[PDB]
């Protein structure tokens, strides 16, 4: 679970992302598609080229969901209910993929927040993304 210090760390870090959240979300997806090519199997309908507006658009939606999760860190399941339904019943993304996106998001944060990305913050963010991942796949079966 997320301790009070974990919650503090996540809110601080995310706070600093601030307005760049959408740009960081797109960067994270781009990192994921290049590093883990199998993830491209869920977006056969997207233009996955560098700078693609579809990826940028998708990046903002993902980032916006994470902002919503940080805001409701104490009641994630309800905040993310509609997104859990979506992933479980329509998208049906294998749960392994969430770990690959989470890793890419961490890489993106590291690359943009040198000062803020301390070992303690790194650990809290990893725990937070694992929690979001868990909520998102909780209704698969």
């Amino acid at each position: 679970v997320l301790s009070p210090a974990d919650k503090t760390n996540v809110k601080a870090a995310w706070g600093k992302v601030g307005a760049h959240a959408g740009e960081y979300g797109a960067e994270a997806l781009e990192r994921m598609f290049l590093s883990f090519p199998t993830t491209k199997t869920y977006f056969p309908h997207f233009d996955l080229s560098h700078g693609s507006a579809q990826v940028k658009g998708h990046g903002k939606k993902v980032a916006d969901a994470l902002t919503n999760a940080v805001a409701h860190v104490d009641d994630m399941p309800n905040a993310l209910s509609a997104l859990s339904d979506l992933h479980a019943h329509k998208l049906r993304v294998d749960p392994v993929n969430f770990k690959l996106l989470s890793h890419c998001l961490l890489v993106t944060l590291a690359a943009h927040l040198p000062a803020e990305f301390t070992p303690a913050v790194h650990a809290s963010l990893d725990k937070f993304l694992a929690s979001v991942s868990t909520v998102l796949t909780s209704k698969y079966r």
């Binding site: 090519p37 199998t38 993830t39 199997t41 869920y42 056969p44 479980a88 998208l91 049906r92 993304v93 294998d94 392994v96 993929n97 698969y140 079966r141």
Partner: protein, 146 residues
């Protein structure tokens, strides 16, 4: 694929006892039931509403025969799986868009099915030999992804 001669024989010998059509239908139906996300590829198959509907769906059964027939032919080429599955690897990536993780799920459901089917004859060493084969095949099918 590196299997000791002992392992290859264990594989070949049990396989000789398999009804490919039957086991095929069972394995694919069980994948769809145990791991419902996998139904994402089979929406045109009709009714997958319950375990009974899935196990009894003629489209599921036909697809399982097809998948296990290929698997079956691959057991003849244990020494060249990558070569044997190269075209299917490309197809699955480029046209079907199947996350290779599903090959691993099917391989584990297949082992459960064989265990259910063979009972005591499916010994720890026989399972180990089949584990290597299912991993081999999964790897071979994921090989051409890009």
């Amino acid at each position: 694929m590196h299997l000791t001669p002992e392992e290859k024989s264990a594989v070949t010998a049990l396989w000789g006892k398999v009804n490919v059509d039957e086991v095929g239908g069972e394995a694919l139906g069980r994948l769809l039931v145990v791991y419902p996300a996998t139904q994402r590829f089979f929406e045109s198959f009709g009714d997958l509403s319950t375990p009974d509907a899935v196990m009894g769906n003629p489209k599921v059964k036909a697809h399982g025969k097809k998948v296990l027939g290929a698997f079956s032919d691959g057991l003849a080429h244990l020494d060249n799986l990558k070569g044997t599955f190269a075209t299917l690897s490309e197809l699955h990536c480029d046209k079907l868009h199947v996350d290779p993780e599903n090959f691993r799920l099917l391989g584990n459901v297949l082992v459960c099915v064989l265990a259910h089917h063979f009972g005591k004859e499916f010994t720890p060493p026989v399972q180990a030999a089949y584990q290597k084969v299912v991993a081999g095949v999964a790897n071979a099918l994921a090989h051409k992804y890009h």
